[PDB]
Point group: C3
Chain length 455, copies 3
């Protein structure tokens, strides 16, 4: 006679399609393969980043805490599963007592000493009504909830290592462009110091060129420390240090990522691990309903023992000294003060709070995926505009070079065209860094990379 109630799936409050507008693109229907099935070996193309994630899934320690928390709750489920069963041990019953002359058996103050070992249960409570069954069911639901949360931890780790590597590549490209702008400012100050010695340029243009060079040196040192900062952050996120023999990974100009189907908002309820973690927390509260409801009914205990008793220790292995104890007990609360109804509606409160936790998880997951959809809809237009800016600034540089080569234009204006080209490329690097990090965050938000390859 089990008393866990019938499970009822809570409805999702999310509308059945991802939101439309001027910033989004056109959605598709159901996908043959969702995002939670293409692994981090196919979605991540370049070999260096695949080797870094293959290192960081093993050497990092937060994923190790996640997997060990899973195996800890294996042990914690095994506790309750064995608590459903007896504990067949021994015990030693020894009562050496002194009573007055009125209370004893001899009519005199006497020291009586009966002591002898015996095996059997120590108040083993048998489970007629399903309260121990529902406690181990709660333990099993908590176990597989946390082994869904381990997949959620691996998802966040793969996304964080990917964003750390992409910011490392983009920030060392920024460092190279600031080094090149420092080179052009140094050449312009060299020419202004040359024209200052001869006498064409006054000392005001010399001080202006010197302020420009010192600003470029400050920018160069700041990007040097930023490369050091996010390289140390990647050393943290890999667990171990960066290995030496990494392959020549693909730069930012190639297609570093693959296309991912968005799908339906109702498809997300079975694939993202945070959703299906909060769902099994809700099933654990569903088992706690039965754990609190199975207190109203008669709980049955057993106390059995079997072993030899004696008076002296010397005559404990002989004939006629066998013994055995059998003691059942039933128990039924006629009128408590309201602790059982308080435990029942407290379990119902925990059930509805975990309903709210599951539904909040669906809402935040839908918001993160709609964030990723809006960014994937707008960054293609932003980077098309930015690459047209880079191409127009490069054509302006080539025309300033073509005016310089024939002689009608100075070298300082050619260096101004070089620095406007480098400002255009420094903007392009950061816009593509924002595109790639939001693409990785969208892949995390849909189903994440838990499988290694496509299944």
């Amino acid at each position: 006679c089990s008393l866990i109630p019938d499970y009822q799936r809570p409805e999702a409050p999310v509308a059945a399609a991802y939101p439309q507008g001027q910033a989004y693109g056109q959605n598709t229907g159901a996908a043959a393969v969702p995002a939670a099935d293409i692994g981090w070996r196919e979605f991540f193309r370049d070999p260096q980043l695949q080797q870094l994630i293959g290192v960081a899934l093993e050497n990092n320690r937060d994923l190790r805490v996640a997997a060990l928390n899973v195996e800890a709750f294996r042990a914690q489920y095994r506790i309750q599963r064995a608590d459903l069963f007896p504990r067949i041990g021994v015990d030693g019953s020894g009562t050496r007592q002194r009573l007055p002359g009125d209370l004893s058996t001899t009519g005199s103050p006497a020291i009586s000493s009966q002591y002898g070992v015996t095996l059997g249960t120590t108040a083993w409570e048998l489970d007629l009504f399903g309260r121990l069954r529902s406690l181990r069911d709660q333990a099993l639901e908590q176990y597989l909830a946390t082994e869904q949360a381990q997949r959620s931890a691996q998802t966040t780790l793969v996304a964080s290592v990917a964003t750390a590597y992409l910011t490392l590549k983009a920030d060392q490209a920024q460092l190279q462009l600031t080094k090149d702008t420092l080179g052009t400012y140094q050449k312009s100050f060299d020419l202004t110091q040359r024209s200052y010695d001869v006498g064409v340029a006054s000392a005001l243009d010399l001080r202006q060129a010197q302020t420009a060079v010192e600003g470029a040196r400050a920018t160069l040192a700041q990007y040097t420390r930023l490369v050091a900062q996010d390289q140390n952050a990647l050393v943290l996120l890999l667990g171990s240090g960066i290995p030496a023999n990494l392959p020549q990974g693909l730069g930012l100009d190639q297609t570093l990522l693959t296309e991912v189907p968005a799908g339906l908002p109702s498809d997300l309820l079975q694939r993202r691990p945070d959703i299906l973690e909060a769902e099994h927390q809700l099933m654990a509260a569903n088992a706690s309903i039965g754990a609190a409801r199975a207190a109203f009914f008669p709980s049955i205990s057993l106390t059995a023992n079997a072993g030899t008793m004696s008076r002296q220790l010397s005559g404990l292995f002989d004939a006629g000294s066998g013994s055995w104890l059998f003691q059942p007990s039933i128990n039924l609360p006629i009128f408590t003060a309201g602790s059982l109804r308080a435990s029942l509606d407290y379990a119902k409160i925990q059930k509805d709070i975990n309903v709210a936790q599951y539904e909040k998880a669906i809402q935040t997951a839908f918001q993160e995926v709609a964030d990723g959809l809006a960014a994937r809809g707008t960054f293609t237009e932003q980077l098309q505009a930015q690459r047209d800016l880079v191409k127009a600034s490069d054509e302006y540089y080539q025309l300033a070079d073509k005016r310089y080569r024939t002689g009608v234009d100075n070298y300082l204006t050619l260096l101004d065209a070089q620095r406007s080209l480098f400002t255009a490329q420094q903007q392009l690097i950061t816009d593509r860094l924002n595109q790639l990090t939001s693409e990785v965050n969208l892949y995390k938000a849909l189903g994440g990379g838990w499988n290694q390859q496509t299944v």
Copy 2:
């Protein structure tokens, strides 16, 4: 006799007046109508914002978690109140035992059955020294603490919906200005393309106009993204989507929300919810002192019982079989190994943990209110300087338009003046967003939006 210690509250470490200087305003005297009295309908002037609070206030999930955690701790208080009273029920306790020949009555190994069903209690205590009653009002004051926590959760919900809606309107106005800057850049590029196709302008300023247009299209894609992400954030924070029948929402430069009287710093000790939460955790710590003190005094307990006992199982109809037990049980710990000093010491240490927690909540409340007062004091000067900036740039554009319409300058300088006026309007909208965000956080920090009208 009860044993809970008497409680006077700790005084506030923060000053008796809000800070003064060049940033703040003059101090108001007191509050006849304080800040927590004014509801969100007599504070928020948008009917759209009133409808969005009316949706989000009962259709959220985290506020639902708080409002059900209140019910959870009422269930825990019902547990602790019901454990004052005995466990009056029915039980049937049979013992079948084998005894060896030395321990039996007749001297021969035989059996002896004790099959008797009884009614009554097992091991309940009455504490006339005040241990269970101190645990009872500890549970009561944890309930009062978490209902104050529920009020603070609704307060932060109201502040977050208001800030998300104000940033949504500000990003709408940002997008409507970025479309016009893109219009003026595209029109200036069409003029330079016509000037290039005839032959007046070179290719260099044509590439400059192309880079300007592509910068405008990049920032247009960025603001479409940012508007879509802000709508997704407000879909998260309402709980459901934006509903259908929204009324008219007024502008951003009008009176979006009325002024709030600040009052004294001591009025936070009664109006603010989180300070009252720390207050009730402090008096629950005093109740826990009274519980962990009352174990020195002797506990009086008894296991009352009344039933029908017999050797045989089939019989209880006899008139003489009205069996009953009384069994009182009184204990007294006279000298342990310093267990009870350690328990009383740990409870007193928890009390002056919660003292420090209480005045740390006071100090963070005072800091949030003082930053809100500084924002009130400085944003009037900043926003008036910003409106004078916008008036100056508007008059400059009007004079450039008069200069163009008479015929002296061309249309490119008119488009440059128009872009300067658009940049001034953009910075005005950002500063007004900052003012409204800081005053919503000030209203959140003073007393919050709990009730609607007066009591």
Copy 3:
């Protein structure tokens, strides 16, 4: 017998030296005096900041919570250490029997009773195989973990008050320079208003003068707001107000601090506090697996009595009415169905979890220290570039002042030169702020805010 397993030979999860690159200067090798025995009075040369740290230590409330948590775990260690020693305490027992005539010892249904007062113990277990010994060892090592957590809280509080005071003083300097820029713009607007009222400059130059002045007055109000917010944040981090009798502090130009020798990565895990509290949580997990391994063994328990009993109230303290009870019990389980095995596995997994958290703590310490070393290596050459920029703009301003005093250029070009000099000093002051706040963060990351008294 004790069953706590042996401690393991430590492997390093880190390279044996701080990294090298363009940012990193050069390793200093090992150090004689580490970074933890440099107290905050021989490190912070600023006497005003030293009194501010003194107020922040004897007045803030997070240190009250931390030191009171250490006191709470002293009480918890005593309440778990006291479980070895026998809880002896005089008590009072009694029964009042109603057995029927089938069950009575005489043959008629009668009333029987047996009561008495006995000095003795109740269900005391003798810790023969070290389970409660292992639990008090666990409580002792969690006490040491709580003490190292208090040391970590104190060094982070010293760092936070140093950085808050430092940003306060730097934003005082920022407010003073933007008040000077507002002065120069107001004087340039006075000159342009005269040059308009006479007739030379048109109204468009007057509108550029107004847009400059209103931009500057907006930024002046913004920095008054920001100084007020940062001073209220410093009031939060102190817990008490700024005291009145402060000495004259040192400005940001001269050395407020000195460089602390970093050393090797091998004395982090001896000097840093959070690594040590992770180490003591690991030791507590070793004691937990000691108790779990001792759980297989037989757990002997005892009761005892030395008092008197009788059946009558008026004669229980007569001669020869003494009583005495001895109750030994050897108890070992044989069949546990995988419960004690499961709790053993759960404690081994707690050991592995605390190993992983200790190793994570070493990795986060190494990452934060390496970021501090990056900042120390780069901010020197960046600040040299910034000071050369300020000196070149100051020479440019001296040349523009010579051109003004002779009579070649008007006063508006000198105000343009002051506009450039002031923003040069703006960027210099915020860069020196970044250097000093990252130096304080490195000093926290090596873990040296603890000692003021002797060792």
